[PDB]
């Protein structure tokens, strides 16, 4: 089995508050983490906020979150937007209040603030697994200074971030994670790595795992084939371990905006289909050298099936029963 098989539900206090509840395979109500934890899942991925108006995914909401995943005897990876909202290629929107205008402001509030996030873990008694220093930062990230015209000043707010982390409290340091979508890309993931690296901003031992996005639905040219050779290039360039940090699988596409990858255009868009999809996924990680896990992305945010992408359906709950699909036991063990 992959060192880690894991789920992104943090989204899951917001659908409980709402009045959701999630049943196993035998049609028994019961938490999401336990009924994860049962089938073999084994981490969980929660996304971070800094200062959303509206408390969602922030420190308060995380750390109730984590407090049932640590009880469910589940890891935790900690995903950084460094933002008040969604953090990706194209927006890497600063917190409100951090500076957009003086690098050494901001390189002093970005180690303050994962300091600050790990401290306060500790002072709850949970312990994290990774952390990773923003999320899909292809494109650079805490935007203005951290855009890809200065892979320098990206450098060296990684390398803030990553020394908050190191300075923390928490008992053992949580490995310290570099997010980029488009895992599929060799050129793109190298680029980035490479630039950065050149800079000495940013230092080889500043973090110690690679993770990728990768989904099937946003262009035909995210073959396994490819991801294959990126994960392999990733690990072997830069002797780092690789995760699929994020992936989606539909149960229902009725027209898809993108062409799937040749090497996926025979897989069903159904719970079987799902299967079939994780399973030749962790085929592709387990055989690269150092290929750690899968993370499926929000399987059971009821109300947002399709998860942004052209598809119908990509949970692995059923949006009428509430009841979990046996896609979970798969994930579980892969
Ligand atoms: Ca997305």
Not at 179 to 206: I, P, R
Not at 226 to 247: F, G, H, I, R
């Amino acid at each position: 089995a992959l060192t880690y098989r894991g789920a992104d539900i943090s989204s899951l206090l917001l659908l409980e508050d709402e009045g959701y509840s999630y049943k196993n395979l035998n049609g028994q109500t019961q938490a999401l983490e336990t009924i994860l934890a049962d089938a073999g899942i084994n981490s969980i991925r929660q996304r971070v906020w800094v200062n959303p108006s509206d408390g969602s995914y922030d420190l308060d909401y995380n750390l109730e979150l984590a407090k049932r995943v640590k009880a469910a005897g589940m890891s935790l990876y900690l995903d950084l937007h460094l933002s008040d909202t969604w953090a990706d290629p194209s927006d890497q929107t600063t917190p409100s209040g951090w500076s957009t205008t003086d690098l050494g402001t901001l390189k002093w509030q970005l180690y303050n603030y994962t300091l600050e996030v790990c401290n306060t873990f500790a002072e709850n008694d949970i312990d994290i697994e990774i952390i990773s220093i923003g999320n899909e930062i292809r494109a650079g990230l805490l935007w203005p200074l951290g855009e890809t015209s200065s892979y320098s000043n990206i450098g060296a707010l990684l390398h803030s971030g990553a020394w908050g982390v190191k300075d923390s409290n928490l008992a053992t340091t949580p490995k310290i994670m570099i997010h980029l979508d488009d895992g599929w890309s060799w050129d793109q993931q190298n680029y980035f790595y490479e630039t950065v690296l050149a800079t000495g901003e940013l230092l080889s031992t500043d973090f110690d795992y690679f993770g990728v996005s990768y989904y099937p639905f946003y262009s035909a040219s995210a073959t396994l084939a490819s991801l294959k050779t990126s994960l392999a290039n990733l690990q072997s360039t830069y002797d780092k371990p690789v995760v699929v940090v994020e992936t989606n699988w539909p149960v229902s596409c009725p027209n898809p905006a993108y062409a799937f990858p040749s090497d996926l255009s025979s897989i069903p868009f159904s719970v079987a289909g799902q299967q079939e999809f994780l399973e030749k996924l962790a085929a592709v990680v387990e055989a690269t050298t150092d290929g750690l896990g899968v993370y499926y992305w929000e399987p059971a945010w009821i109300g947002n099936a399709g998860l942004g992408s052209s598809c119908a359906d990509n949970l692995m709950v059923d949006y009428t029963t509430d009841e979990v699909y046996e896609s979970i036991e798969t994930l579980g063990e892969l």
